[PDB]
Design a protein around this ligand. Structure first.
Ligand SMILES: O=C(O)[C@@H]1CCCC[C@@H]1COc1ccc(Cl)c(Cl)c1
Length: 135
């Protein structure tokens, strides 16, 4: 086993969101995509197989899937169709995901807190908090 497996692996459902529209504005997402994406209630499926972590997000808006090794950069196409270079590390028990594109950067942190998986998305001064619980 591993810390990663015990903390994050499973199937999670979105239960609350704060400031996600404002986060998406700051990222540069256009009006129509913000409206449809902001309505979504994704499930987050996290798995581990050896060194490879997979995070899948399934919703009525888009389905995404990333697979990666901690510390090792990869190319990602986000739900809003940005082509980013991503690096994900596990720092003090928090998954830290940095996306770089067009000279810009956003950081997504995933944390266990009580029975929740808390996602914090930061773009310059703007944070969105999205709370997931086990399905
Ligand atoms: O949907 C979620 O809770 C997940 C949470 C984890 C980070 C990824 C995503 C949030 O990030 C998004 C999702 C959709 C769009 Cl359109 C943009 Cl700009 C970002």
């Amino acid at each position: 086993g591993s810390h990663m497996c015990d903390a994050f692996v499973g199937t999670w459902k979105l239960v609350s969101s704060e400031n996600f529209d404002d986060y998406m504005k700051e990222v540069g997402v256009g009006f129509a995509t913000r409206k449809v994406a902001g309505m979504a209630k994704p499930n987050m499926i996290i798995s581990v197989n050896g060194d490879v972590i997979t995070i899948k997000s399934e919703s009525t808006f888009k389905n995404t899937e990333i697979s990666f090794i901690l510390g090792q950069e990869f190319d990602e196409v986000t739900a809003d169709d940005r082509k980013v270079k991503s690096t994900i590390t596990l720092d003090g028990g928090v998954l830290v995901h940095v996306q770089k594109w067009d000279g810009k950067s956003t950081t997504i942190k995933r944390k266990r807190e009580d029975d929740k998986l808390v996602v914090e998305c930061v773009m310059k001064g703007v944070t969105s908090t999205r709370v997931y619980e086990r399905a």
